[PDB]
Amino acid sequence: VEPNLHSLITSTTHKWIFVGGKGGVGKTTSSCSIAIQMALSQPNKQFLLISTDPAHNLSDAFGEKFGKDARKVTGMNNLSCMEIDPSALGSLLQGGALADLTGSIPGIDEALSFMEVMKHIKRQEQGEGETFDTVIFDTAPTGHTLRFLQLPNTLSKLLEKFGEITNKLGPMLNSFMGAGNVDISGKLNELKANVETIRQQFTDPDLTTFVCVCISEFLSLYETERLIQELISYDMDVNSIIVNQLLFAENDQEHNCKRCQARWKMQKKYLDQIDELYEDFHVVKMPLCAGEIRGLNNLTKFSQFLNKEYNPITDGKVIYELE
Amino acid sequence: VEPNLHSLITSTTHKWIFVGGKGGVGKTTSSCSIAIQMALSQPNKQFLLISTDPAHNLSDAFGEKFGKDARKVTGMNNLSCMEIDPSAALKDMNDMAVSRANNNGSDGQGDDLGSLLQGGALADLTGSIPGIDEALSFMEVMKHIKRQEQGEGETFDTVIFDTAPTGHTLRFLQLPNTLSKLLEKFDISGKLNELKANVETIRQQFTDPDLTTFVCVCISEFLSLYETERLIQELISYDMDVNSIIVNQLLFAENDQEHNCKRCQARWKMQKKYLDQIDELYEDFHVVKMPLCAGEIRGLNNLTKFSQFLNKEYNPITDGKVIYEL
Ligand SMILES: [Cl-]
Ligand SMILES: [Cl-]
Ligand SMILES: [Mg+2]
Ligand SMILES: [Mg+2]
Ligand code: NA
Ligand code: NA
Ligand code: NA
Ligand SMILES: [Zn+2]
């Protein structure tokens, strides 16, 4: 199992790529980098990179204004970006009943949010986009955004418990508690149907994968291990971890600084834990750069190391020149 | 609210001080430093620093061999350390309780935790009732302390609990509530009642903000911030007083050095960001900001020099040379 994302970058079967990682972990740089690498490597296919971050992280990363309308990133004719706010008559009753459910039932809020992002995609495609071959999902930093994948099971198990209890005695008691009951069954069952359809593609490892992003630090390893467990319970394919902010301190010409040297001793300790824990994962080890990486130019030079492993002995020049 | 633990260090009211923080966050160094500061500021009192870490963190921190029997740290007149393993001690006591149940087995019964473990019944309920494992484990530590307080004037005035690196140690504080419900349903119930009453007695002191407090330990990074928020919320749910956060491993990079190593400068920039977040989120807390030292900080000498910055705020302009001295 190669310490790179080369097989993903050149894959012609994947249409849905999720990228995620909590805690200032280089996630958005990684999303941008994966999108660039795939677009450069497959110039015949059209790629979309989409974010739901209210901070407009893609606009910040590329240095240009992105929005709800898909726009090509300047310098590419192959990659487009979107930034959408997914948070943004009987329908008022239908919505109010459904709003009450988002707070108490896990997966409903996430389903409605993701259904909205999918609506934005197909709208951009029909209105001369014209069709994206693969979508890179830059996942939100907060929340468990793929939780909707457990919803079809959650709410069918709830319907059976509903079916067991209601059939006790009635219809005296049934009509009393069900008085003024807004049905919302048709709106709920179509949501279940929409998820089950999405699940068919998202649980297919040839069509969909999740790339985890982390740093070589105790709490980030902890967060990564739980992220992977969450994704396994969704039956979502995960075999890629990007480890960012690595110092490779023993290498740099202009050595010294013990603070940095001690920090890399600790990073190396958790790297050995990652190597041992994730033996059959693509664990791609990415160098720290001075500042954050912004602009198409710096993003492509840095992104290359997702495809062919960074070698601190030879590639140091490239990094200390992005700086 | 001052960015130090001065009022805690000089408090003649506190009996139980908990120190905790997960992630390699300087927790052991903070426990030791709190213990040293209190013992130096209150020479007329006797202090116990106790650890429950099987890796023997206090022995490694002081460069002395500590254990089950309380020992004064060399160079100190009024600070002693203990290192025990309550889970391993409970497993041993429980195995014997089960062995006495299977055979025709009597008990000494003259109190207290030994009576709770009868038949091993309470121990195999630890999987269905949260807080039991933690209650019995903490009963083990209280037992060891009371035994160590011999008979004579060898009773400690204040105990500093260096909390274990793993688990939710103080979860037992929720027990009296979860057991009052459970038993509202509902020999075994007799043991549940003895346990509930035991924890309620602890609560009288552990929920008294004058007697008991918890010091959180973190680092200035996103995940450590949210882990600390999580810890704080946990302690609030226990009615544990918590109004102190120690932030370790701070570079203060713009000072001391100058402009050398931009990687440290970049790191310090990120630290300032979350330091600002912490300052605002926890405005009523003592937020104590502690410098990074190149290396460990081990031994009484280095630990007492470092620990002074818990009492009086580290000033990067003034105190940089002290960190170089270590
Ligand atoms: Cl997204
Ligand atoms: Cl997720
Ligand atoms: Mg990020
Ligand atoms: Mg530690
Ligand atoms: Na006996
Ligand atoms: Na302890
Ligand atoms: Na706890
Ligand atoms: Zn440095």
Residue numbers in the entry:
A (entry chain B): 5 to 92, 117 to 351
B (entry chain A): 5 to 190, 211 to 350
Give the exact sentences the study uses for this entry:
Get3 (also named as Arr4) is the yeast homologue of TRC40 of mammals. Get3 can recognize and bind the TMD of the TA proteins. In this study, the crystal structures of Get3 from two yeast species, S. cerevisiae and D. hansenii suggest that Get3 may adopt two distinct conformations: an open conformation in nucleotide-free state and a closed conformation in ADP-bound state.
The crystal structure of S. cerevisiae full-length Get3 was determined to 2.3 Å resolution. In molecule A, residues 191 to 210 are missing and in molecule B, residues 93 to 116 are missing. One Magnesium ion can be located at the ATP-binding site in the NBD but no nucleotide molecules can be found even in the presence of ATP (or ADP) in the crystallization conditions. In the crystal structure, one Zinc ion is coordinated by four Cys residues, C285 and C288 from molecule A and B, respectively. A large hydrophobic groove is found on the finger domain of Get3 structure that might represent the binding site for TMD of TA proteins. In monomer B of the Get3 dimer, a hydrophobic helix α9 from a symmetry-related Get3 monomer makes strong hydrophobic interactions with the putative TMD-binding groove. In the S. cerevisiae Get3, the two Get3 monomers are swung away from each other. The S. cerevisiae Get3 crystal structure represents the open conformation while the D. hansenii Get3 structure exhibits the closed conformation.
